[PDB]
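Assemble and predict.
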Amino acid sequence: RMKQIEDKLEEILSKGYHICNELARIKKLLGER
Amino acid sequence: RMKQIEDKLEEILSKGYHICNELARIKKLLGE
Amino acid sequence: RMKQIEDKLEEILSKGYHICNELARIKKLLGER
Amino acid sequence: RMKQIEDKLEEILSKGYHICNELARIKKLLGE
Protein backbone atom coordinates (compact mmCIF):
# COMPACT_ATOMS: atom_id res chain seq x y z
CA ARG A 1 0.00 0.00 0.00
CA MET A 2 2.84 2.46 0.75
CA LYS A 3 4.34 1.17 -2.52
CA GLN A 4 1.05 1.85 -4.33
CA ILE A 5 1.15 5.38 -2.84
CA GLU A 6 4.69 5.89 -4.11
CA ASP A 7 3.56 4.53 -7.50
CA LYS A 8 0.61 6.97 -7.70
CA LEU A 9 2.69 9.98 -6.68
CA GLU A 10 5.02 9.26 -9.59
CA GLU A 11 2.04 8.81 -11.94
CA ILE A 12 0.64 12.18 -10.90
CA LEU A 13 4.02 13.92 -11.24
CA SER A 14 4.66 12.41 -14.68
CA LYS A 15 1.24 13.31 -16.03
CA GLY A 16 1.73 16.83 -14.74
CA TYR A 17 5.00 16.97 -16.65
CA HIS A 18 3.12 15.55 -19.65
CA ILE A 19 0.34 18.06 -19.33
CA CYS A 20 2.67 20.98 -19.02
CA ASN A 21 4.64 19.80 -22.03
CA GLU A 22 1.40 19.61 -24.09
CA LEU A 23 0.50 23.18 -23.08
CA ALA A 24 4.02 24.31 -23.91
CA ARG A 25 3.72 22.94 -27.43
CA ILE A 26 0.30 24.60 -27.72
CA LYS A 27 1.73 27.94 -26.58
CA LYS A 28 4.58 27.48 -29.09
CA LEU A 29 2.39 26.87 -32.15
CA LEU A 30 0.17 29.87 -31.29
CA GLY A 31 3.08 32.27 -30.77
CA GLU A 32 4.41 31.41 -34.24
CA ARG A 33 1.05 32.42 -35.75
CA ARG B 1 -4.36 7.10 7.09
CA MET B 2 -2.49 5.64 4.13
CA LYS B 3 -5.92 4.72 2.73
CA GLN B 4 -7.32 8.22 2.95
CA ILE B 5 -4.18 9.50 1.15
CA GLU B 6 -4.16 6.83 -1.57
CA ASP B 7 -7.86 7.46 -2.11
CA LYS B 8 -7.25 11.18 -2.78
CA LEU B 9 -4.32 10.41 -5.04
CA GLU B 10 -6.51 8.22 -7.24
CA GLU B 11 -8.92 11.12 -7.44
CA ILE B 12 -6.17 13.67 -8.34
CA LEU B 13 -4.91 11.24 -11.00
CA SER B 14 -8.38 11.09 -12.52
CA LYS B 15 -8.49 14.83 -12.88
CA GLY B 16 -5.21 14.58 -14.79
CA TYR B 17 -6.69 12.09 -17.20
CA HIS B 18 -9.64 14.42 -17.66
CA ILE B 19 -7.29 17.34 -18.36
CA CYS B 20 -5.43 15.27 -20.99
CA ASN B 21 -8.75 14.58 -22.77
CA GLU B 22 -9.55 18.28 -22.78
CA LEU B 23 -6.10 18.96 -24.24
CA ALA B 24 -6.70 16.30 -26.92
CA ARG B 25 -9.99 17.95 -27.99
CA ILE B 26 -8.30 21.41 -27.79
CA LYS B 27 -5.32 20.44 -29.90
CA LYS B 28 -7.66 19.13 -32.63
CA LEU B 29 -9.76 22.32 -32.71
CA LEU B 30 -6.48 24.18 -33.24
CA GLY B 31 -5.53 21.93 -36.20
CA GLU B 32 -2.70 20.23 -34.35
CA ARG C 1 2.48 17.17 9.33
CA MET C 2 -0.37 14.75 8.51
CA LYS C 3 -2.56 17.88 8.57
CA GLN C 4 -0.19 19.63 6.16
CA ILE C 5 -0.45 16.54 3.92
CA GLU C 6 -4.24 16.70 4.03
CA ASP C 7 -4.00 20.44 3.28
CA LYS C 8 -1.76 19.87 0.22
CA LEU C 9 -3.92 17.07 -1.18
CA GLU C 10 -6.88 19.46 -1.16
CA GLU C 11 -4.75 22.19 -2.78
CA ILE C 12 -3.73 19.82 -5.56
CA LEU C 13 -7.30 18.59 -6.12
CA SER C 14 -8.70 22.13 -6.20
CA LYS C 15 -6.10 23.41 -8.65
CA GLY C 16 -6.78 20.40 -10.84
CA TYR C 17 -10.46 21.34 -10.80
CA HIS C 18 -9.39 24.92 -11.56
CA ILE C 19 -7.15 23.85 -14.38
CA CYS C 20 -9.75 21.65 -15.95
CA ASN C 21 -12.32 24.42 -15.70
CA GLU C 22 -9.91 26.83 -17.50
CA LEU C 23 -9.40 24.29 -20.30
CA ALA C 24 -13.15 23.76 -20.51
CA ARG C 25 -13.73 27.47 -21.06
CA ILE C 26 -10.92 27.47 -23.65
CA LYS C 27 -12.50 24.51 -25.47
CA LYS C 28 -15.87 26.33 -25.33
CA LEU C 29 -14.68 29.60 -26.90
CA LEU C 30 -12.88 27.72 -29.70
CA GLY C 31 -15.85 25.51 -30.56
CA GLU C 32 -18.03 28.62 -31.00
CA ARG C 33 -15.55 29.96 -33.58
CA ARG D 1 7.49 8.35 5.24
CA MET D 2 5.08 11.24 5.72
CA LYS D 3 8.01 13.51 4.77
CA GLN D 4 8.75 11.75 1.51
CA ILE D 5 5.03 12.02 0.61
CA GLU D 6 4.63 15.67 1.62
CA ASP D 7 7.80 16.46 -0.31
CA LYS D 8 6.36 14.98 -3.53
CA LEU D 9 3.05 16.74 -2.99
CA GLU D 10 4.80 20.12 -2.85
CA GLU D 11 6.46 19.21 -6.11
CA ILE D 12 3.16 18.13 -7.79
CA LEU D 13 1.59 21.39 -6.56
CA SER D 14 4.37 23.36 -8.22
CA LYS D 15 3.69 21.74 -11.54
CA GLY D 16 0.08 22.87 -11.16
CA TYR D 17 1.14 26.45 -10.64
CA HIS D 18 3.33 26.15 -13.72
CA ILE D 19 0.39 24.80 -15.74
CA CYS D 20 -1.79 27.73 -14.61
CA ASN D 21 0.87 30.17 -15.88
CA GLU D 22 0.94 28.41 -19.23
CA LEU D 23 -2.86 28.64 -19.38
CA ALA D 24 -2.65 32.37 -18.56
CA ARG D 25 -0.22 33.00 -21.45
CA ILE D 26 -2.36 30.73 -23.72
CA LYS D 27 -5.61 32.46 -22.93
CA LYS D 28 -4.06 35.84 -23.81
CA LEU D 29 -2.70 34.63 -27.16
CA LEU D 30 -6.26 33.51 -27.92
CA GLY D 31 -7.67 36.98 -27.09
CA GLU D 32 -9.42 35.81 -23.95
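Chain B has one domain: 1-32.
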